[PDB]
Amino acid sequence: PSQVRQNYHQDAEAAINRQINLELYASYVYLSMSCYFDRDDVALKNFAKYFLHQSHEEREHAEKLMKLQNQRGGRIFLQDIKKPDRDDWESGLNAMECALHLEKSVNQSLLELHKLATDKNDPHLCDFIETYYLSEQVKSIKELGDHVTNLRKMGAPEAGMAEYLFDKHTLG
Amino acid sequence: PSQVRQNYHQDAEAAINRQINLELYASYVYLSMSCYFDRDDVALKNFAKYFLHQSHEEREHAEKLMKLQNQRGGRIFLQDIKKPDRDDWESGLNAMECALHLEKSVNQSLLELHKLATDKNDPHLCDFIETYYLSEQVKSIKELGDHVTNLRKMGAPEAGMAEYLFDKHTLG
Amino acid sequence: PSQVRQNYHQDAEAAINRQINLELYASYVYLSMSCYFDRDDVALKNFAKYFLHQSHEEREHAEKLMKLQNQRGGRIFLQDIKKPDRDDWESGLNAMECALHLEKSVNQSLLELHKLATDKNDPHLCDFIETYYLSEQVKSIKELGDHVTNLRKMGAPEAGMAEYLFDKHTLG
Amino acid sequence: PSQVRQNYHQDAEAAINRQINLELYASYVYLSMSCYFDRDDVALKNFAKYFLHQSHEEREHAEKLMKLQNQRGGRIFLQDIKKPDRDDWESGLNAMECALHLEKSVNQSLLELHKLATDKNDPHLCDFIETYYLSEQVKSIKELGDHVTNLRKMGAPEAGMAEYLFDKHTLG
Ligand SMILES: [Fe+3]
Ligand SMILES: [Zn+2]
Ligand SMILES: [Zn+2]
Ligand SMILES: [Zn+2]
Ligand SMILES: [Zn+2]
C-alpha cells in the first residue's frame, strides 16, 4: 500500500475514480450547452456564459477529487469522457431542465458515495463529501429549479421575448 | 404604581399590549410571505426580499412599543402570535393585496389607539403614535397601493412576464 | 414532488417545520426577557441588550431553517408562536438559568433532528445541523453556564451589587 | 396686540411665563444638587457632573420657552427664582429621588399647559409642547427611575461602596 494510506477502502478509491469521470462528463455537457448558446441562430450570450461557468466549476470539482484520491493514497485511473447526449439543446429552458437533471444525477452519485464512506467507517471521506460537494449540489439544484420556474412562467420558449429578457435580467 | 408612571391610563397600557401583539403578528405574516417567494416553484427573489424587509420592520415597530410601555411605567404582557391565515400566497399580486389589507388593519388599530389616547388626555402617547406610527402607515399603504396598481396594469398574474419584470424593475 | 426534492424524507420536512417553530418561540422568550430588564424597577440595560441580541439570533436561526426547507423542496408550514411561560423573570440570575434551560431544550430538539436525518440517510441535512446549529448550541450553553456560575458566586440576587456589577463588567 | 400675534390666548401667554419660571427653578435645584456633590465631605464628581448637566439643560428649556413667547407675540414677564427646598441633599440616592419628584412636577405642569393649549385650540403650542417637552420629560423620568432602582438595589446609601461604584460605572 501507499505509505500514506490509512482507513481508505479499495471500494472508496474505485468510487472516487468513478466520481472523477462523472464530474468531467458534467463539465463536458455544460461546455456543449455553452457553445450552443453561442451559435448565431441562438445568440444568448448570458446563457452561454452561465453554462461555461458551470463547465469550469465541474472541472474544478473533478480536480479536487483527484487531489483527494492522492491525499488518501489512492491511485487515479482515468476513463474516456463520453460525449454529451445532445448536440442541439433546443432552448434556454430545455438546457436549464437538462442541467437540473444532470445536477440531480451527480447529487445521487455523491449520496451513494457518502453511503459507501459511511458503511466503510471513513469519516474523513464522509466529511469531505459533505463539506465540498453536498451543499454545493443542493444550492445548484435549487438555483436551476428557480431558473426553470421563471422561464416557464415567462412563457419560454414559445414567448419570444422570454429567453431574451431572462438572459438580460437573471443571467446578466 | 410604577415610580415613573404619570398620566398613563390602564386602558392605554392594555391597548399598547394589544398593539404589540398585532405588530408581531404582522411581522409573522410578512415572514410567511417572504418564504413563499423563496419556494423553487415561485422563485421571485425580490418579492421575497421585500417581504422579509417588511417583516423585520414590523418587529422593530413591536419593539418600539415595548420600549414605550416600559418608558411610561406600563407592564408588557405578551400573548401568542397567531399563525398567518395562509401558507400559500398564490402570487406576487395577491401577496401585495393581502399586505395592503394587513397594513390598513394595523392602521385602523393605531387610529383607535390614538382616539383612546386623545380621550384619556395623554398627549405624549398621542404624539408618539403620530410621530412614529401614523405617517409610516400612510406611506406603507400608498406604496402597496402603487405596487398593486402596477402589477394589475401589467397583467399579473396571468401575464407570465408581469411579476418577473416587476420583481426586477420595481423591487430590484 | 418539488422539482428540486431529492433524498428529503417527509419526516425530516415535518421535523424542520417543528424546529422553525421552536426557534421562533425561543426568539420570543428572549424578547420577553429583554423587555423585563428594561423595566424601570429592574433597569439592567446590559442584561436587556444581551437577551435582545439572543432574540434576534434565534430569529436568524429560524430564517435559516426556512431557507433550508425551501432549498430542499420542502414546504414551510407555520404554527402559532406560543407566549413565554413567564411575564416576570424575577432576576438576572433567574433569567440566565431559564435561558440555559431553554438552550438545552433547543439543543435536545436539534439532536433528535440529527438522529432522524441520520436514520433517513440524509447527509446534507446532518451536515447542515452540525455546521450551523450544534456547535452554536454548545457554545451558547457553555456561555450561559459560565454566566450562571459567576452570578451565583457573586451572591446574586440577594447581594444587591452582584447583578449590577455583572451587568457592567461581564455584559457591558 | 403684537403684529405677529395670532391664535395665542392670553391664558396661554400667562401659562408660558409660569413654565419659564418653573424651568428656571428646576435649573436652580439641579445646580444646588451639583454643588452638594462637590463638597469635600461628599466628593462624588460624577453625581456633581450629572446634576450640573441637568441644570444647564433646564436653563435651555427655559430659554426655548422664552423664544416661543416672543415668536408668538407674547411678552415675557420674569419672576423671582425661588431657592431650592434644601441645602443638603443627604445622599446620591436622595438627590436622585428628589430629581425624580421634580421632573414629575415639571411634567405635570407641561401636561396642564398642553391641556390649556388644546382647550384654546392652539395647535402650534400643542405641537411645540409635544415635540420639545413631553418626550424629553418622559425620557428623563424613566432615566431617574432607573437610577433610583439601581442605587436602591445596590444598598445606597447605607452600603458605603454603592454610591461610589454607581458614580463610577453608571454616571462615569
Ligand atoms: Fe467594580
Ligand atoms: Zn460537480
Ligand atoms: Zn407596523
Ligand atoms: Zn437557536
Ligand atoms: Zn425642563
Curated annotation (Swiss-Prot), chains A, B, C, D:
This protein's UniProt keywords: Acetylation, Cytoplasm, Cytoplasmic vesicle, Iron, Iron storage, Lysosome, Metal-binding, Oxidoreductase
Superkingdom of origin: Eukaryota
Molecular-function GO terms, alphabetical: ferric iron binding; ferroxidase activity; identical protein binding; iron ion binding
Free-text disruption phenotype from the record: Homozygous mutant embryos die in utero between 3.5 and 9.5 dpc. Heterozygous animals are healthy and fertile and do not present any apparent abnormalities. They show slightly elevated tissue light chain ferritin content and 7- to 10-fold more light chain ferritin in the serum than normal mice, but their serum iron remains unchanged.
Classification via CDD domains: Euk_Ferritin
Family annotation (InterPro entries): Ferritin (IPR001519), Ferritin-like (IPR012347), Ferritin-like_diiron (IPR009040), Ferritin-like_SF (IPR009078), Ferritin_CS (IPR014034), Ferritin_DPS_dom (IPR008331)
Gene3D superfamilies according to UniProt: 1.20.1260.10
Binding residues for Fe cation 1: E23, E58, H61
Reactions performed catalytically: 4 Fe(2+) + O2 + 4 H(+) = 4 Fe(3+) + 2 H2O
Location, primary (coarse class): cytoplasm
GO CC entries: autolysosome; autophagosome; cytosol; endocytic vesicle lumen; extracellular region; membrane; mitochondrion
Gene Ontology terms: biological process: immune response; intracellular iron ion homeostasis; iron ion transport; negative regulation of cell population proliferation; negative regulation of ferroptosis
Annotated compartments: Cytoplasm; Cytoplasmic vesicle, Autophagosome; Autolysosome
Residues in Ferritin-like diiron domain copies: 6-155
Listed Pfam families: Ferritin (PF00210)
EC number(s) per entry: 1.16.3.1
Major enzyme class: oxidoreductase
Binding site for Fe cation 2: E58, E103, Q137
Record family assignment: Belongs to the ferritin family.
Described function: Stores iron in a soluble, non-toxic, readily available form. Important for iron homeostasis. Has ferroxidase activity. Iron is taken up in the ferrous form and deposited as ferric hydroxides after oxidation. Also plays a role in delivery of iron to cells. Mediates iron uptake in capsule cells of the developing kidney. Degraded to release iron upon autophagy activation by nutrient starvation.
Quaternary context: Oligomer of 24 subunits. There are two types of subunits: L (light) chain and H (heavy) chain. The major chain can be light or heavy, depending on the species and tissue type. The functional molecule forms a roughly spherical shell with a diameter of 12 nm and contains a central cavity into which the insoluble mineral iron core is deposited. Interacts with NCOA4; NCOA4 promotes targeting of the iron-binding ferritin complex to autolysosomes following starvation or iron depletion.
PANTHER family, per the entry: FERRITIN, FERRITIN HEAVY CHAIN
Protein name per UniProt: Ferritin heavy chain
Gene: Fth1
